[PDB]
Short mmCIF file of C-alpha atoms in Angstrom, two decimals:
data_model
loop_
_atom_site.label_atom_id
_atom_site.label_comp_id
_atom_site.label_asym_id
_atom_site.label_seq_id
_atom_site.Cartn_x
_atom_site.Cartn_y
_atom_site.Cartn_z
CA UNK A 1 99.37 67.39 105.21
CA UNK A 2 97.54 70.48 106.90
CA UNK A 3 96.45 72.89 104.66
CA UNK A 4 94.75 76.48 104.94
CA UNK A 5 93.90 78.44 101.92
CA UNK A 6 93.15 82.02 102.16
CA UNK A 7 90.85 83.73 99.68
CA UNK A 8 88.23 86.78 99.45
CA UNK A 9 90.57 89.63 99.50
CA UNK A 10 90.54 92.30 97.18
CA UNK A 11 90.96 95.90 96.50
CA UNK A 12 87.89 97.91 97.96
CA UNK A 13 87.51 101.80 98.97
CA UNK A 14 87.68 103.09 102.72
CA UNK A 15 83.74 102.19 104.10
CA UNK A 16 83.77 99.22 101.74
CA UNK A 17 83.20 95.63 103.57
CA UNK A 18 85.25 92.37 102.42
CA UNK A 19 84.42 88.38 103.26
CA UNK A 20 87.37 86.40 103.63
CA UNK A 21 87.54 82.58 104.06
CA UNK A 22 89.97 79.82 104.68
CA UNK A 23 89.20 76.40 103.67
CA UNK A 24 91.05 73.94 105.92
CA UNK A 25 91.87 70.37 105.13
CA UNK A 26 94.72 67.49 106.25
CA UNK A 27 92.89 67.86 110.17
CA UNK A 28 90.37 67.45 111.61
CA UNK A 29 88.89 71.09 111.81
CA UNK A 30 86.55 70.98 114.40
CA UNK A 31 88.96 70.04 116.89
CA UNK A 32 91.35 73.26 116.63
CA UNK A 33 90.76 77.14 117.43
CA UNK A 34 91.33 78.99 114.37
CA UNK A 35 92.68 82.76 114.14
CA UNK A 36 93.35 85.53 111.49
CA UNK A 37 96.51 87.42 112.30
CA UNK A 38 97.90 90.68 109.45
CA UNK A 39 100.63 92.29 107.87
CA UNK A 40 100.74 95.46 106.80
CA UNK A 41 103.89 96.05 104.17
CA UNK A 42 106.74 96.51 105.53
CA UNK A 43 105.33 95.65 108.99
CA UNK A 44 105.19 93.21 111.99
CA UNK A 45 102.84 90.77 112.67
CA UNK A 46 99.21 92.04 114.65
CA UNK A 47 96.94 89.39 115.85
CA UNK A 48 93.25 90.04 114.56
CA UNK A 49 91.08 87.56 115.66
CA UNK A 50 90.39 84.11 117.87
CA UNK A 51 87.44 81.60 117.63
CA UNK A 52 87.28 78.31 119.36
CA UNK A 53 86.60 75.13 118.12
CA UNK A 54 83.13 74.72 118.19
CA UNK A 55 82.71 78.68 118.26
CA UNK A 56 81.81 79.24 122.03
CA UNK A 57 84.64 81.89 122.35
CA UNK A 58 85.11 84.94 120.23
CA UNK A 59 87.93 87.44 120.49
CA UNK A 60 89.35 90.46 118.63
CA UNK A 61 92.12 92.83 118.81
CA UNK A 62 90.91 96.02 119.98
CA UNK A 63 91.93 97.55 116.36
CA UNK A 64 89.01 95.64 114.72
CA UNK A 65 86.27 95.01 117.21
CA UNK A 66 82.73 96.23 116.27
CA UNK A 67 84.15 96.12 112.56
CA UNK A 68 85.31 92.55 112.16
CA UNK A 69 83.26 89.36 112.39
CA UNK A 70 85.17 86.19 112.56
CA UNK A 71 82.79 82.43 112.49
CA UNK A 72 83.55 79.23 111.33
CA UNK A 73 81.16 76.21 109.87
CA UNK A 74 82.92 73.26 110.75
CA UNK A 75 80.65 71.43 108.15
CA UNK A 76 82.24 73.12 105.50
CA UNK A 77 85.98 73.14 107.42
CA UNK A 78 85.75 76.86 106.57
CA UNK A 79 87.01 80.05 108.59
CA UNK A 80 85.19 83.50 107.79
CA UNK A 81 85.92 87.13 108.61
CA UNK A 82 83.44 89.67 107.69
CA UNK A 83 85.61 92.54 107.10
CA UNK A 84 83.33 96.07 108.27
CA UNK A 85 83.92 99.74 107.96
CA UNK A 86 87.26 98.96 106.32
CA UNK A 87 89.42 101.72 106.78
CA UNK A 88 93.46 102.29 104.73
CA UNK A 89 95.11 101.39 107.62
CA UNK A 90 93.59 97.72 107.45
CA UNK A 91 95.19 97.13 104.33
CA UNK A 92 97.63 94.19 105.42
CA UNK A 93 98.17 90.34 104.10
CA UNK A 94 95.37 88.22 106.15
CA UNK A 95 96.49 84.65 107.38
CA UNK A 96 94.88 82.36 108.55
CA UNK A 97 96.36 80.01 111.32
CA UNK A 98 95.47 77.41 113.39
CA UNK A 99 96.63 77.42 117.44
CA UNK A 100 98.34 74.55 118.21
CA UNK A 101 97.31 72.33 121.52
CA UNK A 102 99.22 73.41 124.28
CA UNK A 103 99.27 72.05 128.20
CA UNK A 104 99.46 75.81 129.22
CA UNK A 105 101.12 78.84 129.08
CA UNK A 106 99.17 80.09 126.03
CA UNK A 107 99.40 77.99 122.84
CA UNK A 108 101.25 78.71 119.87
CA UNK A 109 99.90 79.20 115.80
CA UNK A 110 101.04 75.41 114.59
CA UNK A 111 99.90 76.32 111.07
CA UNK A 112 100.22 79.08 108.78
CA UNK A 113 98.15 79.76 105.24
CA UNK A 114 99.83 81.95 102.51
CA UNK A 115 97.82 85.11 102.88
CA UNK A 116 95.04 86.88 101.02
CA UNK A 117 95.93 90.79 100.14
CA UNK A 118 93.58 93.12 101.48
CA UNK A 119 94.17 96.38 99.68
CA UNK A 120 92.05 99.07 101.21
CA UNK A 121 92.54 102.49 98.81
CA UNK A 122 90.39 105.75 97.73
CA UNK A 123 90.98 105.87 93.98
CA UNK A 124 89.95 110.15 94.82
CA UNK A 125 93.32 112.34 93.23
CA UNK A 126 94.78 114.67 96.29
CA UNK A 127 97.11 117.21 95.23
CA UNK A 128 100.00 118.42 97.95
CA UNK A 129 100.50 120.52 100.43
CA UNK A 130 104.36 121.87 100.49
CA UNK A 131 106.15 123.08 103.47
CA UNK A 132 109.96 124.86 104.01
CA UNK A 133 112.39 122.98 106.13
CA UNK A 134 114.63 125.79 107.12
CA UNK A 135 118.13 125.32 107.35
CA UNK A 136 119.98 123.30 109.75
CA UNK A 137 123.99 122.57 110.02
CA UNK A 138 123.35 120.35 113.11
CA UNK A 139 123.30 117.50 111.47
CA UNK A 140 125.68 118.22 108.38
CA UNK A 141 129.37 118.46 107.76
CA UNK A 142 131.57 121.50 108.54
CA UNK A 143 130.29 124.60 106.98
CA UNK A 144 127.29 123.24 105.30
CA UNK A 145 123.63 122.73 106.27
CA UNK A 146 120.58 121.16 105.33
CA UNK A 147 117.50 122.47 103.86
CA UNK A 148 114.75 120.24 102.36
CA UNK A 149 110.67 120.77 100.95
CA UNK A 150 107.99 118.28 102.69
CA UNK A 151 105.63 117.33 100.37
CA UNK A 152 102.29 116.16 102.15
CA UNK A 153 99.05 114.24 101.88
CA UNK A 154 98.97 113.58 98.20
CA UNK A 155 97.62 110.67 95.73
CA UNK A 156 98.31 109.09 93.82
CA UNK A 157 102.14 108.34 93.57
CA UNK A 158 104.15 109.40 92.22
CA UNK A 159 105.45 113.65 92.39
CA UNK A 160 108.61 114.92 90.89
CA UNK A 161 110.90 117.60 93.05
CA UNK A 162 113.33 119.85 91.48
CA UNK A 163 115.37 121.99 92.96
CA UNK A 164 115.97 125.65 91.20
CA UNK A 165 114.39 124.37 88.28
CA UNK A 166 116.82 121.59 88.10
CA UNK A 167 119.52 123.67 88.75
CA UNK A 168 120.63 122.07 91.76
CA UNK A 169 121.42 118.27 91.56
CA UNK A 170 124.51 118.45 93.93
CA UNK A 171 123.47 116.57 97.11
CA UNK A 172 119.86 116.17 96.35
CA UNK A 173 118.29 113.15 97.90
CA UNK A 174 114.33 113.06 97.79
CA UNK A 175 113.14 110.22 99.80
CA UNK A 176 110.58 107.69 98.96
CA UNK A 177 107.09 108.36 100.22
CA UNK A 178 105.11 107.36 103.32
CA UNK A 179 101.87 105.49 102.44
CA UNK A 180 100.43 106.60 105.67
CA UNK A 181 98.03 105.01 107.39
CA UNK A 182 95.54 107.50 105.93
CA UNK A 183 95.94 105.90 102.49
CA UNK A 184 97.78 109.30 101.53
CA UNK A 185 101.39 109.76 100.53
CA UNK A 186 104.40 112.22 102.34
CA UNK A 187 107.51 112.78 101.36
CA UNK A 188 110.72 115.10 101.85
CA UNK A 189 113.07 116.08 99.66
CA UNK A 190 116.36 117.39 101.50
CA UNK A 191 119.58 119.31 99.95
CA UNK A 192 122.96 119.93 101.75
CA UNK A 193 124.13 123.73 100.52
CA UNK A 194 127.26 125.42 101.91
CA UNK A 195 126.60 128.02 104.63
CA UNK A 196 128.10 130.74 103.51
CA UNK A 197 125.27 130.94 100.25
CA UNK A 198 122.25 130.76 102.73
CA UNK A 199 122.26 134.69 102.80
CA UNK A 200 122.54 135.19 99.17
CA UNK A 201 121.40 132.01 97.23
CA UNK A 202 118.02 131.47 96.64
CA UNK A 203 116.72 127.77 97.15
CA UNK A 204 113.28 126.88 95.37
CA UNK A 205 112.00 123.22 95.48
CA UNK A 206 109.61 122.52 92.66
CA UNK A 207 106.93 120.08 93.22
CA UNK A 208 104.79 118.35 90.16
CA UNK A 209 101.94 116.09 91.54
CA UNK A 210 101.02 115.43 87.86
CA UNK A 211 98.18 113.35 88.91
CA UNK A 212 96.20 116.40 90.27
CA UNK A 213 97.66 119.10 88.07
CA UNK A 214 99.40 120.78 90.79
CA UNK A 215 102.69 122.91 90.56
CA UNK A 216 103.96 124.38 93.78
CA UNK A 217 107.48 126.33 93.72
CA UNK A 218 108.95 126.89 97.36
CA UNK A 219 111.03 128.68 98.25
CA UNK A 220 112.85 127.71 101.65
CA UNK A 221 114.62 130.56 103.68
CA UNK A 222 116.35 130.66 106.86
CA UNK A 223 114.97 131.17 110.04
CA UNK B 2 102.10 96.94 123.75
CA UNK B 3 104.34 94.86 121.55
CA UNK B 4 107.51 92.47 122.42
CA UNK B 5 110.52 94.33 121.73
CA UNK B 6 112.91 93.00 118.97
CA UNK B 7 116.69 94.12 117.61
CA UNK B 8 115.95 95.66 113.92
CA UNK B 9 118.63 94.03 112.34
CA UNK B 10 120.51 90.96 113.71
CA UNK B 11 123.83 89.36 111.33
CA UNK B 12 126.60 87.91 110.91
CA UNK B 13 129.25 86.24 108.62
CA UNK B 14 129.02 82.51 107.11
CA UNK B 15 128.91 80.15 110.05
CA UNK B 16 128.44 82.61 113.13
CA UNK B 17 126.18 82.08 115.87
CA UNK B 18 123.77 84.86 116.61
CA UNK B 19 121.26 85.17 118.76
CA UNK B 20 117.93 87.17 118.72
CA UNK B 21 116.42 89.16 121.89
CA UNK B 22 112.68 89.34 122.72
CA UNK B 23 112.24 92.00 125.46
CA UNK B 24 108.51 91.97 127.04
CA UNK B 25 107.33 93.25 130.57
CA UNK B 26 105.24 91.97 133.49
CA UNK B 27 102.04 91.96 131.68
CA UNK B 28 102.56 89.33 128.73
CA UNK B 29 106.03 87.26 129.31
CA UNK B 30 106.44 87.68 133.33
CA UNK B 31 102.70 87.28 133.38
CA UNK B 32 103.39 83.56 133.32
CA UNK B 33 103.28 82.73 129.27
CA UNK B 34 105.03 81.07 127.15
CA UNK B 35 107.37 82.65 123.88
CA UNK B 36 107.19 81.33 120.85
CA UNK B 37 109.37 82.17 117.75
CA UNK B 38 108.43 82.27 113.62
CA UNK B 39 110.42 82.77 110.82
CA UNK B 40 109.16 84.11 108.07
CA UNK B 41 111.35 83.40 104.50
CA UNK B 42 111.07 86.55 102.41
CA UNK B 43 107.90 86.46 100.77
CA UNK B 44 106.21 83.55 102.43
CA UNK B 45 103.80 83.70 105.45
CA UNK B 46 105.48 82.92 108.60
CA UNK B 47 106.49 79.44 110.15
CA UNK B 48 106.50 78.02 113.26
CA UNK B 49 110.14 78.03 114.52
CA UNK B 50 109.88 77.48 118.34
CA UNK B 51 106.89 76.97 120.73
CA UNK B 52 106.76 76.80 124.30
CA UNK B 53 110.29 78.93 125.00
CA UNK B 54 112.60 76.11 124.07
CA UNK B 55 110.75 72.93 121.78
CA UNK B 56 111.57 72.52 117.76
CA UNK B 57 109.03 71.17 115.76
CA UNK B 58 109.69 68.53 114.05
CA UNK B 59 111.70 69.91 110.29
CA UNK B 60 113.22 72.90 112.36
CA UNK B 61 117.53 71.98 112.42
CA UNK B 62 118.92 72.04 116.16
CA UNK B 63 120.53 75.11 114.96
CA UNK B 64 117.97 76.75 116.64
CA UNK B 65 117.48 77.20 120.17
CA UNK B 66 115.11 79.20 122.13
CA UNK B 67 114.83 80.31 125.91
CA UNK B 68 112.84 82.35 128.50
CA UNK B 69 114.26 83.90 131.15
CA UNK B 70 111.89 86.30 133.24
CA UNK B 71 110.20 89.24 131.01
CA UNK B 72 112.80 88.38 128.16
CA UNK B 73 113.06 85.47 125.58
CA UNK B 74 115.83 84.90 123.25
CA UNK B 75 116.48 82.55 119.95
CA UNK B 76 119.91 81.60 118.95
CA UNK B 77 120.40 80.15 115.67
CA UNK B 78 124.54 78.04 115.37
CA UNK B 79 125.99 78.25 111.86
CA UNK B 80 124.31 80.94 110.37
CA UNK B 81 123.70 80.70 106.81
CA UNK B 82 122.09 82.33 103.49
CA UNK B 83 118.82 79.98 104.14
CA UNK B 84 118.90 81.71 107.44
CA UNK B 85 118.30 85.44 106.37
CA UNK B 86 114.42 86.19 107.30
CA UNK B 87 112.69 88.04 109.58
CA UNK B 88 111.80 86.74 112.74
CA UNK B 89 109.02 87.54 115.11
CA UNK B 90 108.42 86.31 118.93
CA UNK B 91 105.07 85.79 120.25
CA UNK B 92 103.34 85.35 123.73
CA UNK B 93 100.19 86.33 125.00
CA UNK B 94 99.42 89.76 127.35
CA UNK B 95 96.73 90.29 130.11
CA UNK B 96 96.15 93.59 129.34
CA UNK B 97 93.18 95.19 127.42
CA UNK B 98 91.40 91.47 128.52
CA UNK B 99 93.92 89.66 126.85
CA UNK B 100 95.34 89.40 122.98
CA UNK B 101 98.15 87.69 121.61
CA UNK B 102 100.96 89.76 121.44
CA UNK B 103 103.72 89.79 118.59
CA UNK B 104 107.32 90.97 118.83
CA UNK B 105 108.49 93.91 116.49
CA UNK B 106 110.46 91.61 113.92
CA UNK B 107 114.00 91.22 113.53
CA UNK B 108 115.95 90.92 110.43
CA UNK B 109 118.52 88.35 109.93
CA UNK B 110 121.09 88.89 107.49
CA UNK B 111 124.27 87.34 106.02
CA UNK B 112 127.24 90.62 105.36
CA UNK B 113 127.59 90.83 102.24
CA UNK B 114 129.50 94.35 102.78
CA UNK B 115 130.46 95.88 106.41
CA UNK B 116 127.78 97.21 108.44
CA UNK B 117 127.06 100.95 107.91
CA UNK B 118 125.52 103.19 111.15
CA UNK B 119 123.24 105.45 109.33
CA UNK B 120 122.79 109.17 109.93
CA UNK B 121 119.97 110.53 111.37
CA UNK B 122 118.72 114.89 110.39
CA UNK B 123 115.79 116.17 112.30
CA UNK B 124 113.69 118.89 111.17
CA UNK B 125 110.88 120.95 113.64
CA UNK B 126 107.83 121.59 112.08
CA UNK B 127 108.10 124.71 109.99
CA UNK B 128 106.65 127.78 111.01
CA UNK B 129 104.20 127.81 107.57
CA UNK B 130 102.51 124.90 108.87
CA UNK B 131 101.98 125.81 112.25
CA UNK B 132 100.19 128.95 111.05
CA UNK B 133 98.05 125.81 109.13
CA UNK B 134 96.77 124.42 112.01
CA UNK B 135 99.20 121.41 111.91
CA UNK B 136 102.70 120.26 112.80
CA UNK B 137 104.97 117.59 111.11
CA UNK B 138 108.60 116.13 112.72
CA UNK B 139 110.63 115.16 109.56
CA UNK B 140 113.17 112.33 110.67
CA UNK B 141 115.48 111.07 107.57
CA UNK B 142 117.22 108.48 108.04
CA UNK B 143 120.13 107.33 105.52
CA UNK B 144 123.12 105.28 104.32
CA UNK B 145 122.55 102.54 107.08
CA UNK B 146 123.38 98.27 106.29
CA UNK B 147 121.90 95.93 106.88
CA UNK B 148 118.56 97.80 105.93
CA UNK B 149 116.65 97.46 109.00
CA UNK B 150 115.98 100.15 111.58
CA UNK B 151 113.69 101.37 114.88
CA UNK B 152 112.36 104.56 115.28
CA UNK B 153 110.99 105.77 118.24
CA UNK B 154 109.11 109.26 119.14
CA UNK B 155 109.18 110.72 122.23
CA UNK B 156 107.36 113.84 123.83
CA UNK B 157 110.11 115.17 126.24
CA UNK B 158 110.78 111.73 128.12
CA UNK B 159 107.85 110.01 127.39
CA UNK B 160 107.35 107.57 124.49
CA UNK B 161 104.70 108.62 121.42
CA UNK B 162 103.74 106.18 119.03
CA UNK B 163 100.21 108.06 118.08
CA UNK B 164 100.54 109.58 114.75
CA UNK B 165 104.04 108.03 113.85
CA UNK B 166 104.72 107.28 110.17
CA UNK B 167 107.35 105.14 109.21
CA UNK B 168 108.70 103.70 106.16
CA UNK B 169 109.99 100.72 105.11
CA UNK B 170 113.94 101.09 104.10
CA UNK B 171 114.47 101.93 100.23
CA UNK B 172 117.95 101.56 98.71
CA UNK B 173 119.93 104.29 98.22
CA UNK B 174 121.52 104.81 94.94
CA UNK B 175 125.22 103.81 96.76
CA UNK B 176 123.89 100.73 97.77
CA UNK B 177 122.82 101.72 101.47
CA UNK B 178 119.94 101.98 103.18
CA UNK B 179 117.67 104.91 103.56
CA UNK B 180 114.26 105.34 105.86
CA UNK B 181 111.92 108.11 106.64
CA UNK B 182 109.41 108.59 109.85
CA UNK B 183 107.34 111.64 110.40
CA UNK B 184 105.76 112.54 113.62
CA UNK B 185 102.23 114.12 113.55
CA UNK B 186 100.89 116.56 116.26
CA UNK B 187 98.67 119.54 116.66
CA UNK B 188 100.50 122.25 117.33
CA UNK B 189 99.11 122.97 120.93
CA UNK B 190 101.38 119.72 121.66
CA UNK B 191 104.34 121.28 119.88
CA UNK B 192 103.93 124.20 121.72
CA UNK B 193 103.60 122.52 124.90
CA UNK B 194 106.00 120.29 125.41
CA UNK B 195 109.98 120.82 126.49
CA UNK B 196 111.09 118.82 123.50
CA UNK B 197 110.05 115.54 121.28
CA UNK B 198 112.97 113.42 120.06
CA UNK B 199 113.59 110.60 117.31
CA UNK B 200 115.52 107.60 118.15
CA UNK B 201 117.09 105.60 115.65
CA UNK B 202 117.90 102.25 116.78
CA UNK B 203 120.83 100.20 114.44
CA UNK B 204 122.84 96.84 115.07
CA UNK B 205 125.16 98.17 117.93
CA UNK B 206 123.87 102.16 117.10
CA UNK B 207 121.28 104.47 118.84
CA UNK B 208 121.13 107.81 117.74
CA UNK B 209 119.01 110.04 119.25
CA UNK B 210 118.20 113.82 117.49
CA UNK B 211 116.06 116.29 119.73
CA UNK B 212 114.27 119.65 118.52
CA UNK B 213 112.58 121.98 120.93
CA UNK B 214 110.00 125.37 119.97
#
């Protein structure tokens, strides 16, 4: 049966480089374009790269080009990509898959290989920056609003919020961070309070990046 | 530019549902074919349909798959708990010189409790961070099933998807979904637009929140 097996990836910092290959076999390899299309987590599918059989035709997705290298040796049935520049928001699953033949219309990827992880991470701690979100009934039930701490650009996971000093539990929900795309993590933390205590209750959020050593206590007034 | 794809698509034991694949003039009225993979939780994706409408051989007849102008669409008879995956179109765009282009994913899923619409709170960018030199739209997103969503950004009218942040859906502790997006700009582009928006796109649900300076 046709087989493609993904290997070379790896854990590397941002400016690193990475090799991956794919060693086909079941086909005859020299007879098919070959392709490496990603997956970032919890993501879609982004086409990468394109070379043809016998290597006369290169492509790449605008994302990579002048970074990524993608060649073949159809001696050793092997697909390459020289991985460049690498940068957080590469980090992804890499397959490897074959396009099928196709009369027209644009062929199809016939053949899929399990992946190789490409994890693409500065290992340098980041403590937070914390901001107010003010208080807003618009989206809340009668006579209550919404008033929450965002907790940016930190690393690594994870930070602790608190609200009061742990104080207030009632109708706390702190959402799990964003990895963003610059390898650093965001979250908010958001607390439903009744209306009529905005002018007299005091509402601190208390963030603990423990990683960095950083404390910030917030307090979030109306506007 | 990406093929546009439902979030979340499902159904009870033995429904037929179908999935939509909405593209434009440059990639599927450009004169190519759709294709369709599914892709099994925690495998790498199959081929499911290629050339708008042919099965490989393995794939059931449950499956069907059409083309009709700048849309595709894949219907899948007798839905089952084999069936739940994510599914992606794919066609091919003459834009940019050319690329293969992928739809957005869709999210098949057998009920195993009623669908929920989730709830969408929208917060401006505080005034402490403008005074930083920055600006951050906080869109939460919570108690939503099945736990699949879209969020779109727009500046007044206009769609932004520069400096979007999205996560994946977490499970809340009552058993719902839960998602976060934040929106980054400078604050010149805060200032300077009427309003920006976030859409939340669910099953049979849009909910749009707006916030203005």
């Amino acid at each position: 049966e046709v087989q493609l097996v993904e290997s070379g990836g790896g854990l590397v910092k941002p400016g690193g480089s990475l090799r991956l290959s794919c060693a086909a076999s079941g086909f005859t390899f020299s007879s098919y374009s070959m392709n490496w299309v990603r997956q970032a987590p919890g993501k879609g599918l982004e086409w990468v790269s394109s070379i043809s059989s016998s290597s006369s035709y290169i492509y790449y997705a605008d994302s990579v080009k002048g970074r990524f290298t993608i060649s073949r040796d159809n001696a050793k049935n092997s697909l390459y990509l020289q991985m460049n520049s690498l940068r957080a928001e590469d980090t992804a699953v890499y397959y490897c898959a074959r396009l099928g033949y196709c009369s027209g219309g644009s062929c199809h990827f016939d053949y899929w290989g399990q992946g190789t992880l490409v994890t693409v991470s500065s290992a340098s701690t980041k403590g937070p920056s914390v901001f107010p979100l003010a208080p807003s009934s618009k989206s809340t039930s009668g006579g209550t609003a919404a008033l929450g701490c965002l907790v940016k650009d930190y690393f690594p996971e994870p930070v602790t919020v608190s609200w009061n000093s742990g104080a207030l539990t009632s109708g706390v929900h702190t959402f799990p961070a964003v990895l963003q795309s610059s390898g650093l993590y965001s979250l908010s933390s958001v607390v439903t309070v009744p209306s009529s205590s905005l002018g007299t209750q005091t509402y601190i959020c208390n963030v603990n990046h423990k990683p960095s050593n950083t404390k910030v206590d917030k307090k979030v007034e109306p506007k | 530019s990406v093929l546009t794809q439902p979030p979340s698509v499902s159904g009870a034991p033995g429904q037929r549902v179908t999935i939509s694949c909405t593209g434009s003039s440059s990639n599927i009225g450009a004169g190519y074919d759709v294709h369709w993979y599914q892709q099994l939780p925690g495998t790498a994706p199959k081929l499911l349909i290629y050339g708008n409408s042919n099965r490989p051989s393995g794939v059931p007849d449950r499956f069907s798959g059409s083309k009709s102008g700048t849309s595709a669409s894949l219907a899948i008879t007798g839905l089952q708990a084999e069936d739940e995956a994510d599914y992606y179109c794919q066609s091919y765009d003459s834009s940019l010189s050319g690329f293969y282009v992928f739809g957005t994913g869709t999210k098949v899923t057998v009920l195993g409790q009623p669908k929920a619409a989730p709830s969408v709170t929208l917060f401006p960018p505080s005034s402490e961070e403008l005074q930083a030199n920055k600006a951050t739209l906080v869109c939460l997103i919570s108690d939503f099933y099945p736990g699949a969503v879209t969020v779109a950004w727009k500046a007044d009218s206009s769609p932004v998807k520069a400096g979007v942040e999205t996560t994946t859906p977490s499970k809340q502790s009552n058993n719902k979904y839960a998602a976060s997006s934040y929106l980054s700009l400078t604050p010149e582009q805060w200032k300077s637009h009427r309003s920006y928006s976030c859409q939340v796109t669910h099953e049979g649900s849009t909910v749009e929140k707006t916030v203005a300076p």
